Design a protein around this ligand. Structure first.
Ligand SMILES: [Cl-]
Ligand SMILES: [Cl-]
Lengths: 143, 143, 146, 146
């Protein structure tokens, strides 16, 4: 089975839920979890890896992603992303994430996604800059 | 001129920003401010006024809204909604809100919106339930 | 029922644009969320600016920034209903413009929601207001109610 | 370039659906954000379930819940480009179904992104898995690659 626990992740981010996260069936819509993934990863890249989204030469593009869902959460509930790095490559990295509900031990959902690092003007993949590598390595998972 | 200050509002909510709040021009998109409005109002209605979004008999529908924007914010910046109630009617209420950037005194943006309270099944407007009125009145603005 | 402002009519608008509705346009109460309407406003205007004004959002030097907006809601709509935005230009200044929009059921004549927004155009890198470029102004001028 | 998985072809899909792009589909890097693709998946499937399966999202007793999904991205697209979702059903169980989708430029044949999701159908009030209702199953069956 699962399920994922908080101590299996390296870094955490609270994310506040918004009215419109819920859909017609009353819980956070599956699409929104990936917004959560994307937000946790890039928040980390900016505060700890020197990512410059406004004018930086090198950017992370999502080449792929996925998620399994174990139990719903709903606005206005309080949640938290665990983030870890499964592998750091030469020009890409695979993240693993998990959504946690405040007060619950087991993850509501767990997924992965993959960045490739490219030159912003051309979109040629490029070796990950060093400052970013240092930050990404600091997230290395245990398994 | 403006601009709005924090002490002119009754209740506050931090809202975390998400990767995708920024648009192609790099700042939080104007549309998202109203998601912020909607989130601050309904969060308050649920924790302090007994709003039951899942199964409640009475709901708030937005009959109108607006916003003026004074200066941009951007993900991953940290922000905060001030909320106040300009007037409580028999079956509607006008809220005033303002977006604040952490560390800035003056509001980035300020807007209003109007709820009408209806019966969920029929959508007949109905007098605001008492528990909700108590909470809404506790937000009354000074001017 | 909802906003008590008088409902605008299809004829009061110049230019129309279908927008396809999306699963999550509906919120928990089951109709399109009020915020999404503003996304419809942005999309209609900008689609118009790119196909008729020559707006270059990727590398253009002059951009349009939103300084205010508002909307009144008259009757709900829901995914997967088919909808259509009405657009016109109410006022055309040297560096700013006010748009008026209304959402229709593509099968219908009464507006379901209507509002307004203001663009100010600015040099992209600095954000100093510049005058509206002629190509865009020519496209805006074709939407001024005669 | 991006995902290195082999790109799916337009012919491998059964059913198509235009989706209009929106201003804020583009993120700060200027192309449609990866998350939005999944919104396109949800919309295509559900549009299909309502018009061909009789899904009643407002008051129906059986609903479809998403238990997993994934997507590979091959080439970016951008508002205001015109796009089209390809849909087919890969597997049809008693209470679950796996969909496969791909996004195309409506003018084009190579997929720009492709992925998958799984619906489990459940009694709406409880969320106990129920079998898929016959009307929906008949619509799902028409998408199984022959
Ligand atoms: Cl805009
Ligand atoms: Cl769904």
């Amino acid at each position: 089975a699962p399920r994922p626990l908080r101590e299996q992740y390296l870094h955490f981010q609270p994310i506040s839920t918004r009215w419109h996260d819920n859909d017609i069936y009353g819980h956070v819509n599956n699409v929104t979890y990936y917004a959560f993934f994307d937000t946790a990863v890039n928040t980390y890249l900016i505060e700890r890896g020197g990512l410059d989204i406004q004018g930086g030469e090198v950017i992370g593009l999502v080449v792929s992603s996925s998620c399994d869902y174990f139990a719903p959460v709903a606005f206005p509930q309080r949640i938290e992303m665990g983030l870890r790095v499964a592998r750091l490559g030469n020009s890409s990295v695979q993240y693993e994430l998990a959504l946690f509900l405040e007060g619950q031990r087991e993850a509501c959902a767990a997924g992965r996604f993959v960045h490739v690092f490219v030159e912003r003007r051309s979109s040629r993949p490029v070796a990950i800059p060093q400052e970013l590598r240092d930050a990404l390595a600091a997230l290395q998972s245990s398994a």
